Design a protein around this nucleic acid. Structure first.
Lengths: 102, 72, 246, 60, 50
RNA sequence: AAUAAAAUAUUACUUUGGAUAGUUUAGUUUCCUGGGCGAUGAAGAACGCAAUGAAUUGCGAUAAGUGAUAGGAACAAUAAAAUGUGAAUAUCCAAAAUUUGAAUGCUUGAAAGUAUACUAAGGUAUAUAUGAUAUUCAAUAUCCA
RNA sequence: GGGAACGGGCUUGAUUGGAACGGCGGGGAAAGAAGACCCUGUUGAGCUUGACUCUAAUUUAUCAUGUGAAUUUCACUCAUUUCGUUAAAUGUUAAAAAACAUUAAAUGAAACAGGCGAUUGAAAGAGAUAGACGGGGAGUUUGGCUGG
RNA sequence: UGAAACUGUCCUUAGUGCAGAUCUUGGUGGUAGUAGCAAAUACUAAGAAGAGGAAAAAAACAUCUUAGAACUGAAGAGGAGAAAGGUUCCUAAACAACAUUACUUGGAUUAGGGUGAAUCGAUCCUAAAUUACAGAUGGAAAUCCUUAAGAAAAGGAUUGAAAGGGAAUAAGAUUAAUAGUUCUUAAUCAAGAGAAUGGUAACAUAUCAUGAACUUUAAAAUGGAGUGUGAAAAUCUACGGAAGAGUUCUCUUUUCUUCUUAACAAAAGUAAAUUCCACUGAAAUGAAUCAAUCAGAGAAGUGGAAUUUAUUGGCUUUGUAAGAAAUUCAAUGAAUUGUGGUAUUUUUGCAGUCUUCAUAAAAAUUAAAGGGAACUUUUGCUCGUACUAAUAACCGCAACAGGUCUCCAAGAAGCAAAAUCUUUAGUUAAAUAGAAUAACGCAGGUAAGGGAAGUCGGCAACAUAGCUCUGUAAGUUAGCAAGAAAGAGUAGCUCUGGUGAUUAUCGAAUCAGAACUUUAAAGGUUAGGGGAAUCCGACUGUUUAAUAAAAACAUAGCAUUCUGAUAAAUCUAAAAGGUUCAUUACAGAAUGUGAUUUCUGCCCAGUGCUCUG
RNA sequence: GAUUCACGCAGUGUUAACGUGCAAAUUACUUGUCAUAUUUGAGUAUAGGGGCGAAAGACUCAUCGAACUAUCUAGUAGCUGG
């Protein structure tokens, strides 16, 4: 039973001041600043989270590999696969409908 | 509890030191000095405070470049 | 004497509106050629809840016809509008629910909500929850049409005023009895500061003109002239008839 | 450890030590004391020994 | 306080520098009546209010 | 009925206290002469500088002082050094004059900073209104090809 | 006892040894406060009201000269009011589908107006003079004799 | 006595004569060696230093070491922060003054020393809000607008958070004090410098695998309640130990301590939840949770994909890394560091459920898409960093029993973070003690017989109290009254049975029952007195800080009046000025009564208000 | 916007203690309350015939039925004291 203290000057349990207590050599227990929990991306039509893209910080996406922040498909990364399957049929069935209408 | 009990939460300063007069008279919330009339261009002088004039006016300081001109 | 609570409400120190989480100004789109002489197509992206009003606000997303890019808007939701809808807002638009039309095209008896008061001010009349104004007639001689406001008064408007067809959503809001004090206190979350209202007769003579003596009463008639000075204007102002209506 | 003027920084102090004593500096740590003097903790290169520089200055 | 601005730390530094007594040699002059500093203060007697 | 421990009364000497007496580099009033500040940066504020200073006085990175002209042998609390090849001292002079302040490149809370052009650090100019001149433009406002 | 009518001091008596420790509340008409209750101020202040005398607000009439006409009633816009935009096609001639739409190929994409687009409009608002209203507000007053 | 000025007469002049003003200022008495120096459980013995325990008990003795005895008892009298203070921090010398005695002690005197950042904050962005040039208003001071009025600023200026958003750091060691700041080791970030494949699909490839103008999407970015569960840490515990410590004349294979590991990265092994994809197409309807909930716009089954789970990839494991550290032995050198748990709590995530006339922020900054225009090395500047954070460092005139925002959290016991006791940590001093044991007191108690006869009044005090079982009236808004009232049981020891997982073993506190014994059992601490009526207020709620806490104020309900928005109310001396209004009659403004049920009667003469006369 | 225990907070009663106190309003026991009309920190807004007020003439730096400070001001007093 070791009682720890905040290592930064922040003394209030705010969202940005979350800490985790870990063990350390010799039974000492130290303090670590753990990061916040973030949301993933969302489809631009249905508002559902997209698969294949991790839920990390906005700047942390820059450090990811160029294939670790997209999905290899038309409108990949901004619309779900259901959100895109319907786009193609709209863009095609409509063209056939007004091809013969006029 | 209007006396000793309520005097415990006085730690939020209101007046800090001013820049043109040097007194602790800069009201943080009003953003103006109560003793030397800050950002207002004119030095704040009132005739009812005849003592507050002789506490800080011409002649009370070093007179770095005026003691020379009058001598000449 | 003092300055009564109606005199301190005009300065705006603590009585300003608590409009911080409000979505925005709900109104039509700016007048232009493509709406004066043609129709546009708007997509109702999603229905939202603007705090401080009982009528949902719909986020319509048009296309910029003169330039490249979207022209996002903010429309008060008429009842029946759903996500993914197509609403056309033009002079030649079809008389459906949600389609904005000039008031001069609607047949007599058509229901129009959010009617303008003057062509181009983007919505004045019949904006609250569950309210609507009904067209009455037309007059092609001077291009003016009569409508019946929700208060029952009938007003004459130019035929170019736009008015979204239908009734406003969120109707029948007030039929629910606020049961507690807390529910009535949370209703003013996004409004001004006026809920706990202390009676004039429960006040000292300085604060309110009704400040009574050894018995809690008024003492002088509450029906006042309209030309009273501010501060003494209390009770009922220019009352044509008082008491219960029998 | 020196006592520099406040208006310098960790750049014109790093050159001033190198130029005045002919040494190599790899780290400068500074603080502003209450009196206004800035105390600089100039760390010399591993090859150069601060003991022979200190005797040259006259500390010992 | 823990966090003081630069223009505020240098004014505290002068108020500890001025909180010193008369030097010994000064009092031994001729006709020297300046035996004690009457502008002095302490942290627990008088808060300097600044 | 009695003792004077306490109490009271007078005088002397001493104490706590600073009245009285002697003095005054301080004032008050009157009159005479001037009434001589500032974008070439004032008045005021802040910080800093003595071999040993805390105040104060003097002064401003050339710091209780520098150059020049007058001046003639000192300063002193203590040790030092310099000095008739000129120590003290004086001045309407020359050089210099930190951060601020009308404050004036933007910001200025107790704020740490910072942009462009000229001559890495350094120094310059750039706020608002305004007269004159020069140059670049706008309006078909009036003519006109 | 008399006295200012309830004395520690005065008059006539009773009675009296110096100093003062623990207690306790009868006395010192004990201490605390230029009576707060009452009265006198030709002393105030809050509050009220058809008390006196005024005042902001509100309201009504007159003056302040747009044009075309037939004090009053009409038409127009040109001052003026209320607005809206990215001053973005004003005037006149010739609901099947929650998707995209841009940096043009070869004049394409029509011109002209003395009005950015509308509303109100010589009425309204601000000023001056005059009448009304006005405790919302300011200033002031509310006699005397008197078995209090 | 004193040591350098002064006196008498005439005239003139005055800041000219003190016992009183509750007079002003300065000083000093009696009271008086009196009242006091009494909350915070508490000190004792030996030794050292010191002038400072001597003495006919002068019954008491400050600082430091050790031993004995104790208190705060982990929501601390512990370890650290924000605000405030400003040198109080550490060391040495020293004690005239100050800490209601004294002090060798001190937050006190004097002199030295101390605050180290590319990674923590400020700096950067915006919130409620704030202020400039030009403009409008104003006799004037100055006021208003903040993107509207502008030849100003691709679209709109400045300030505004050390608790909001944010590029990047850890472990061990060191100093009389500083350390995410120094040293060793090990990393990370920013700015530079040197027109591709695979899978049916979900989607995937140690930067790779081009991608300008313009546009869009997303992240940053968001209420609360309650349930279930994954993981880590703490506590408890099972098997096997290694080292040391405690008890031992009575026993105990016994009781206790140590057995640990970071930032950042890797992929031996292996999880829970959710959302998708491919094959087939559900009825005799199924699938599933504590609860739900889901399916022919497609359930269940099989095989896959993605994301969350305190850094990479969640847990074990590995590099870092044992060379560190902890516990021992020897006098610098040597030894060890397995495996579990269907236990309780805390922390952090996930899943759905519930509630709103509440829907619970913005920008900096970053990524992707639509479109097709054309491995090494360098630098990382400025400012804060000491100390208290309180029964002694802040505010209260002070070492004032008052006030002041937070993080970490062991055992016993219980439903409980309750009361009571202890472990790590802090302290034994915090306005002085000794003696005697009178009255009158403050605080805490007990009592024969009676039991409110005391008194304005059961004021004060006493009494009931936890849990299990049985039972529970009138009235009623049908919800409540209700823990109504009333009665029975409860200890100790030895046993038995019920409630599960895997194929006999293993694990949990929980319920029930039976013998036998006694001092007949909740009561050390915590811990409802009950009933019958009447008045007021409907209820939860708020108020005269410092004599009034309610029957007052509020409140949901009922009802009244004006207003079409260029309006109603209404601030300003004025104003393209301001508030409700980011609004529009289910709205804005002005009022009276005060839940529900029942009912609001007659009166328009008077005074108001209104009129289409 | 149910009943209660706890951390906290208040101030119902003793009209207890203290009343030249620890305190220019505090202490002890008893009592109530102890999350949604809840408690609280920082920043910002509202200022004197004004502000704010679930309304007590309450709060507005120990000051309120009109704050503090300075100028008019040595205000006037037929009234008390010298």
């Amino acid at each position: 039973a070791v009682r720890v203290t905040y290592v930064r000057k922040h003394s209030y349990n705010t969202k940005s001041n979350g800490i985790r207590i870990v063990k350390t050599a010799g039974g000492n227990m130290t303090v670590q600043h753990r990061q916040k929990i973030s949301n993933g991306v969302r489809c631009g039509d249905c508002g559902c989270v997209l698969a294949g893209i991790r839920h990390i910080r906005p700047h942390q996406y820059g450090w990811l590999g160029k294939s670790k922040r997209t999905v290899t498909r038309a409108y990949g990364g901004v619309k779900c696969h259901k959100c895109v399957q319907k786009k193609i049929l709209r863009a095609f069935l409509i063209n056939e409908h007004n091809l013969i209408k006029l | 509890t209007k006396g000793t009990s309520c005097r415990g939460t006085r730690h939020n300063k209101t007046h800090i030191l001013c820049k043109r007069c040097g007194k602790r008279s800069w009201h943080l919330q009003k953003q103006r000095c109560a003793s030397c009339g800050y950002p207002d261009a004119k030095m704040r002088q009132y005739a009812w405070g005849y003592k507050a004039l002789r506490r800080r006016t011409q002649g009370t300081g070093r007179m770095r470049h005026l003691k020379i001109a009058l001598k000449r | 004497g003092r300055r009564t609570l109606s005199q301190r409400k005009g300065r705006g120190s603590i009585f300003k509106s608590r409009s911080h989480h409000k979505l925005g100004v709900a109104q039509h789109r700016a007048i232009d050629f493509f709406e004066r002489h043609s129709t546009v197509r708007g997509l109702v992206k999603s229905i939202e809840h603007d705090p401080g009003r009982g009528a949902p606000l719909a986020r319509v997303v048009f296309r910029n016809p003169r330039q490249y890019g979207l022209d996002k808007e903010l429309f008060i939701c008429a009842e029946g509008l759903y996500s993914g809808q197509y609403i056309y807002c033009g002079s030649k638009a079809s008389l459906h629910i949600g389609n904005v039309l000039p008031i001069g095209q609607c047949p007599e008896g058509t229901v129009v909500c959010n009617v303008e008061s003057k062509p181009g001010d983007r919505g004045i009349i019949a904006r609250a929850s569950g309210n609507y104004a009904t067209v009455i007639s037309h007059n092609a001689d001077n291009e003016t049409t009569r409508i019946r406001l929700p208060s029952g008064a009938k007003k004459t408007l130019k035929s170019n005023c736009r008015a979204m067809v239908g009734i406003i959503a969120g109707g029948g809001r007030t039929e629910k009895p606020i049961l507690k004090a807390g529910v009535a206190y949370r209703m003013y979350k996004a409004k001004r500061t006026t809920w706990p209202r202390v009676r004039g007769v429960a006040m000292n003579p300085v604060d309110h003109p009704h400040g009574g003596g050894n018995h809690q009463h008024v003492g002088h008639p509450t029906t006042l002239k309209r030309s009273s000075p501010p501060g003494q204007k209390a009770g009922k102002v220019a009352a044509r008839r008082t008491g219960l209506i029998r | 450890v020196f006592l520099c003027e406040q208006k310098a920084n960790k750049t014109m102090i790093k050159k001033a030590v190198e130029k005045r004593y002919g040494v190599k500096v790899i780290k400068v740590n500074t603080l502003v004391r209450l009196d206004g003097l800035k105390k600089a903790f100039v760390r010399l290169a591993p090859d150069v020994e601060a003991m022979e520089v200190a005797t040259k200055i006259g500390l010992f | 306080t823990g966090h003081k601005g630069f223009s505020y730390k240098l004014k505290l530094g002068k108020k500890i520098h001025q909180n010193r007594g008369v030097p010994q040699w000064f009092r031994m002059k001729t006709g020297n009546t300046i035996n004690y500093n009457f502008k002095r203060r302490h942290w627990n007697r008088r808060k300097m209010g600044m």
